[PDB]
Amino acid sequence: VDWYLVRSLALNLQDLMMPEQENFSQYVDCLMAGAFSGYVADSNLGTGWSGRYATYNPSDDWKKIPFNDFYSKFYPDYFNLKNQSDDELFLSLAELYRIVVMLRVTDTYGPIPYSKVGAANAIKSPYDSQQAVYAKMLEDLDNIITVLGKFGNQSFSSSADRIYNGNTSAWYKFANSLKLRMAMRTCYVAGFNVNGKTSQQLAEEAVAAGVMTAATDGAYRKVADHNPWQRFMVLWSDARISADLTCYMNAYNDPRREAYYDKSTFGTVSGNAYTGEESYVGLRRGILQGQYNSWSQGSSCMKVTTSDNIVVFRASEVAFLRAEGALRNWNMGGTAKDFYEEGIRLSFEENGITSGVENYLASTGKVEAYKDPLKGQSAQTYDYSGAINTNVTVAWSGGDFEKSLEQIITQKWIANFPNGMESWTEYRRTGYPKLMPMAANASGGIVNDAEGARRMPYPTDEYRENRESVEAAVATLTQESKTKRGDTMATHVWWDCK
Ligand SMILES: [Ca+2]
Ligand SMILES: [Ca+2]
Secondary structure, three states: OOHHHHHHHHHHHHHHOOOOOOOHHHHHHOOOOOOOOOOOOOOOOOOOOOOOOOOOOOOOOHHHHHHHHHHHHHHHHHHHHHOOOOEEEEEEEEHHHHHHHHHHHHHHHHHHHOOOOOOOOOOOOOEEEEEHHHHHHHHHHHHHHHHHHHHHHOOOHHHHHHOOOOEEHHHHHHHHHHHHHHHOOOOOOOOOHHHHHEHHHHHHHHHHOOOOOOHOOOEOOOOOOOOHHHHHHHHOOOEEOOOOOOHHHHHOOOOOOHHEEEOOOOOHHHHOOOOOOOOOOOOOOOOOOOOOOHHHHHHOOEEOOOOOOOEEEEEHHHHHHHHHHHHOOOOOOHHHHHHHHHHHHHHHHHHHOOHHHHHOOOOOOOOOOEOOOOOOOOOOOOOOOOOHHHOOOOOOOOOOHHHHHHHHHHHHHHHOOOHHHHHHHHHHHHHHOOOOOOOOOOOOOOOOOOOOOOOOOHHHHHHHHHHHHHHHHHHHHHHHHHOOOOOOOOOOOOOOOO
């Protein structure tokens, strides 16, 4: 057995949960998920991009990357590892990475090639319904949890794991935390069960077995070369913090502002022509390419270095998932209020904030209108001011289900930055947090402004290379949906049925 190759393959599979490769990450995590989650505002002042995901008009090349590139990058190594190793622990971890990676893909598209992927050309296969994908994943995850449990306090080679350094018990907590994330995801699907286990049952089992409970249980990958966000934000200035994120965090006087990003640098960018003040202020999402104010890169920028860890799965997310389950009257091991406050405390700890959580927890600050700081400035033609329509605040009020769910999800959304893939999925599922619509909707009427993008359409090339399977997939997508809008960004995937 060639351990050197097996370690190498395991490492590449692990990476694809939250990819490091800057030219892959930029599309899937920054340009796509970052826009749709409400976290990132594209700030490229060039004419080279014909359109973007944010304005609902990406090019055919951009539409190929979040589908095809996951299959090209994941499956050759996955099939190779299965031929190179018979070790139950390494095969269970390889399957766990497959579930997390393909969870992003089914949450982007709906039906996808999964159970019938060929070793020759993985994507050139029949598509499973999203329900069949979730059912197979949840069933395989139960077996992975059993395998990780029996290894208990045994450790594997730290060189094959840049997240938990071979600590199997940390992977056990991650796997049960994923099980709770997927159980909560399917909570609106009437009669959903996996071998008789309902969403409630899967969630209760995960919590009883052992999920992440401490900030140090969180999954953070030590970069192999550099954190790609340093490129997107600092070096290239292709991305800025969204106006939505600074609207909520300013209203709550959030001390995580200093942990996440910096104050604006309009004076620098303007050559001191800027007459306003510097503050925590993001850029409007969905500004049409070619319609930016020239001082737009003066907007708040992420605080990030090349050596910063990649955020894979935060422990604070698990506490907010338990808060939601407790709100749904599931046995989560405590009240909705206790897990809500625990999620906020865990997020403060994750961001190195040692004081002021008790004052933050009592905060009743209300979200105000977004005032574009460049409005009326020299040679700054555009005004991207707008308003988030919400009364959500921090101080736990209890009572009304929807108002409590909005608190839980809004606080999960602040804590889960910069994990846009997860936050876009949670925005679609619950409707929270309330976000501003895109400044420019270039979908031609396909995408509704209040709903935003609900999915990505299948790449046009897949209709030409795999027509029968893709046409059957669009038929499956329609049959599982409760908002049938064809193979477009407007169609709701199977779990998106609130
Ligand atoms: Ca069965
Ligand atoms: Ca804590």
